[PDB]
Design a binder for this molecule. Structure first.
Ligand SMILES: Nc1c(C(=O)O)ncn1[C@@H]1O[C@H](COP(=O)(O)O)[C@@H](O)[C@H]1O
Ligand SMILES: Nc1c(C(=O)O)ncn1[C@@H]1O[C@H](COP(=O)(O)O)[C@@H](O)[C@H]1O
Ligand SMILES: Nc1c(C(=O)O)ncn1[C@@H]1O[C@H](COP(=O)(O)O)[C@@H](O)[C@H]1O
Ligand SMILES: Nc1c(C(=O)O)ncn1[C@@H]1O[C@H](COP(=O)(O)O)[C@@H](O)[C@H]1O
Ligand SMILES: Nc1c(C(=O)O)ncn1[C@@H]1O[C@H](COP(=O)(O)O)[C@@H](O)[C@H]1O
Ligand SMILES: Nc1c(C(=O)O)ncn1[C@@H]1O[C@H](COP(=O)(O)O)[C@@H](O)[C@H]1O
Ligand SMILES: Nc1c(C(=O)O)ncn1[C@@H]1O[C@H](COP(=O)(O)O)[C@@H](O)[C@H]1O
Ligand SMILES: Nc1c(C(=O)O)ncn1[C@@H]1O[C@H](COP(=O)(O)O)[C@@H](O)[C@H]1O
Lengths: 162, 162, 162, 162, 162, 162, 162, 162
């Protein structure tokens, strides 16, 4: 079953969020992907959040740009851990996204990742690490992936041209 | 009837939002005041927004600090104009409040006012000006108020001590 | 008659403000468009603001970039509600526009929208929502528009390639 | 056993991190608390991170101010999910803390919370929600806590003085 | 005659602008001081700017906080050089004041000074240096003042306690 | 004689400062242009500043990007009014230029203009307005120029395509 | 002999720079302390920089607030390594100090430390580490100091009250 | 022997750090270049830092973008002076890099240079100046280089086209 869901405020966010999905593909982690907007589909957001647990989601990755309300609104309607990804906005280069996601008041948390593509990928990795706590196989695949990343740098110490 | 409602994410916002109410008192404008949180009372926010029109509200002033979702979520659930007040937050002095309120994407607007007390008062004044468009009496009181503000400065040109 | 006017500090602002006008076209809302600069045509700004009410304007959308004085100066000379649009400036990407428009002192409000194109469109939508309070037809068209925006997202939940 | 550990760069961070511990006390969640500095006790950080899994930690909350390296360094040495809390710094009011924690590159994530006390508490709540995924009892206590927070606001709608 | 005028948006600005006046007192430079608000006394601002030249002003120092429109509006209505002083605002510590004053578009300049008291004093010094270009006496007094400032530092090289 | 000098930290600044010179060409104002760096030609800066008055300069326009020391260092070595132009830097888009120029301490002023090309032009206009105080002809040309700028906007009120 | 000099733009900087001197006292490192201002004592700055090498200085720590020109100007006049300390300014909390010091163009470096007291101390530590490269004794004292700092944290792992 | 080492968090940093190496080539200064990541090769970072002194390094230049931990972690594990270069990050244009490097707490310093290429070059120049303190030859080459930079500007005073 899909233990993790990736949601975003707009299809225009996909160019960023696609990197979260990429991680799940590499790690062979079943995942759900959907466009859910707190501003354009508020009712759907509520139904989505309310049914998150019953649908089997253990982690929810939500991405949005500008005045991002999606991550926080979902977190306010469910106990499923919510990780937020600040999409890089045009004018404020994601600073508004970042602040509107991370500065949650006491009581309703949202684990925030870096602005942009790096954050999208990291949100998937973090969600995967959360799942790995109770999934020996995934935990193993995660370990292998990290090893591969490290070794790639280790076997290529000199950045200068050959 | 109360044609305007003043809502805020927390009772701790009252120290700021009280200045919006003060304007309505001076202008003799019936108003509703209530604590509505998108993060702590999400369901109530929805019911409040959905019934806004039927309850007779023509303008809604919403204030919040930090990652402010209140103004935007209300605006996403009603056609009643929503004015947002960025409450000055401790760490980011309202910058996060400001960005999380004003940077709304295309489709759902929130007329934003200055950070803090000045903004709270101005949101009431703006809402009043909106109501005055169809309320000759209020329009008159608004005019008198502005005159009084101007004349006070005009009759006190020298700021130095007498 | 035109119940709303769209003004901007420079013709170079049109690339942004055009999106406000686009909304009015979609909603069939009569509107006036004009270049009015507080810095280059200060006298005209005053005459424009002073005659706003008599000319039938119920809302004024003003856009400017950099040290934006246009919105505030108009608001200081009329009771007609003024909505400001921060045009994205080159160096400071609209942050200066934003601050110079929203940070109005107590007494003279300016409902501010997002930086750039999204804000321009939203200012028109907000102005339209204000007009809809007393225009059943427009209120209906607004409702249909919102429905269309929501349904478009609802019928396209998966952002991935078919 | 303690399934969660709370670490911080300095004892001066305790004034902030104490709010994370407070949450665990309310929720009856066994937790470990310790001062671990990437800058002053780098070797200890490594030993702490390396033994995190074997010691039974499923989540690690790390707080630091200024150029915060603690959260990221721990996350680079273990698969245990790491949540970071930006402590409010004097000069930059936590902005440096925030950026130095959240802007992690692809490969090593750190779920970041709000700057300051609110973030500390939220990091505990998020960690608790993560644990609740497999702890029915804790999940229940979390649910009761949220209910209590919501109801407190619901039974106190008017912020004005009685 | 008074060749320089010091204006400010509010009497609350006097705590800052008083330092500009202090410089003129030290240099024995006749000056006019007055509260002129672009937002509260727009008409007066226009009359003041329009009559600036005929009244004998060769330099105008204008101070304001927040969305400062005063300096720019005066500069748009007269050829008399305008120097602007960003008053330190509460929420944004003068950053909004600074941006709203200095970021003037091509065509209408405003020589901006530092945020706060230091800027107020410097605006007077700069205005004095401008006047000194054609006032040998003032030029001399300016020179003596600078010498005194320099010598004070020179005769006190060690900041440690005696 | 040349009553105004335009200096800059690097030849790479010319792309910006050229707009200051353009103003002087339009106004037929004799001017000197030279590359003077506080960091690369510190001694020359001193000689240039020290001889400014004797060389007949009444105003000095200095432009620089990044940690701009040029404007301030010149102002510290002469009584000739110094106007500073913040060149738009790559990384910080002129914010560092702006702060390093405008935030001068009490005692040594630098009238700062907008970041970039607009500021360069404005610095020339401001310097020209300063000179016009005692140059009836230039004052007249300035007046004509402003009229032309205003009239261009006035005769082109509609920004839409014909 | 004194191999390191501590200079600052104003005696008001001493409250910050005193922490640099404190480090040298602890490490028994002979040092010179003096107020040198690029803005108020420009000539002295030049003489100081020019004679730095002949006077035996191997490192120069310079602190200043606001538009800090001191560090950069010294570095432009000598080959002696210059370390800069951004003093926390009132309005911009050291951000202007930071930018005006660190953003030096290619050719003239200034090793910058943290804003405020922490930076002052660190500049002394860094300078000491530089000297230690050729001073076995100092290198030893530095090592002991670091050990003491580390051990203090190590023997006090629990920040909670006994 | 190589008395200076240039390290960076990723090979993608080479486009920036290459300018540090360029300086060493011009000055004929033996140097080591290597990719060392605190996040991807934490163990290697430790071994690298621990063996820095024994390997003969007297200065270490470390560059990284985003949440830069590399410079600080190295400095926490060795007495060899560490100079940090903030690589310009996409979203925050190096501001996050800058803050995460310079805002080190008391006890472990990192001399920080400008964001980007200019900083990379300057870090090499600063490191060279440090080495020159005990290398007469290098000190001479440094002097010649500075002379050449100065003279190039001096013989090209007019930036206008011939
Ligand atoms: N922040 C939100 C929300 C929300 O918070 O519900 N919905 C959309 N958005 C953001 O609007 C930006 C522009 O979206 P469009 O391209 O569809 O106009 C995107 O970054 C989206 O995440
Ligand atoms: N931004 C929001 C929301 C919301 O967006 O729904 N709810 C509360 N808050 C803000 O949290 C801050 C601290 O509130 P508390 O003092 O109750 O912890 C307030 O500024 C409130 O507006
Ligand atoms: N902010 C203002 C005002 C005003 O405030 O009156 N007038 C023009 N502007 C802005 O100058 C920028 C550049 O305009 P130009 O392209 O005509 O130089 C535009 O964003 C305009 O809105
Ligand atoms: N950021 C770090 C690290 C680290 O990253 O390892 N170690 C200490 N610190 C921070 O230094 C600040 C001042 O600490 P001190 O009061 O002990 O000088 C604290 O916020 C701490 O978290
Ligand atoms: N910026 C302006 C203008 C203007 O631009 O005309 N008028 C007042 N203000 C500023 O409002 C702030 C608060 O003023 P109040 O204390 O009177 O509310 C002051 O800094 C004033 O300069
Ligand atoms: N800020 C200064 C100073 C100075 O302050 O003396 N000298 C050069 N610069 C700036 O360095 C930037 C890059 O210059 P280069 O292209 O020559 O490397 C320019 O903006 C220049 O004004
Ligand atoms: N930045 C400089 C320079 C300089 O750059 O030469 N000289 C003084 N200053 C700074 O002015 C601030 C206020 O100084 P005062 O208290 O003497 O007015 C201090 O932070 C000083 O370092
Ligand atoms: N900041 C760090 C660290 C570290 O601090 O150890 N490791 C990599 N990075 C930075 O990640 C950015 C993107 O790197 P990638 O292109 O490899 O994803 C680079 O600027 C690197 O310095």
């Amino acid at each position: 079953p899909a233990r993790v869901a990736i949601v975003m405020g707009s299809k225009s966010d996909w160019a960023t969020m696609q990197f979260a999905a990429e991680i799940f593909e590499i790690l062979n982690v079943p995942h759900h992907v959907e466009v859910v907007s707190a501003n354009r589909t508020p009712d759907k957001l509520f139904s989505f959040a309310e049914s998150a647990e019953e649908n089997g989601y253990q982690v929810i990755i939500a991405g949005a740009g500008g005045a991002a309300h999606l991550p926080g609104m979902i977190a306010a309607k469910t106990l499923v851990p919510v990780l937020g990804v600040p999409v890089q906005s045009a004018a404020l280069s994601g600073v508004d996204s970042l602040y509107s996601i991370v500065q949650m008041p006491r009581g309703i948390p949202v684990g925030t990742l870096a602005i942009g593509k790096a954050g999208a990928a990291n949100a998937a990795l973090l969600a995967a690490q959360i799942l790995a706590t109770h999934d020996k196989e995934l935990h193993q695949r995660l370990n292998d992936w990290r090893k591969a990343q490290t070794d790639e740098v280790l076997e290529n110490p000199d950045p200068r041209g050959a």
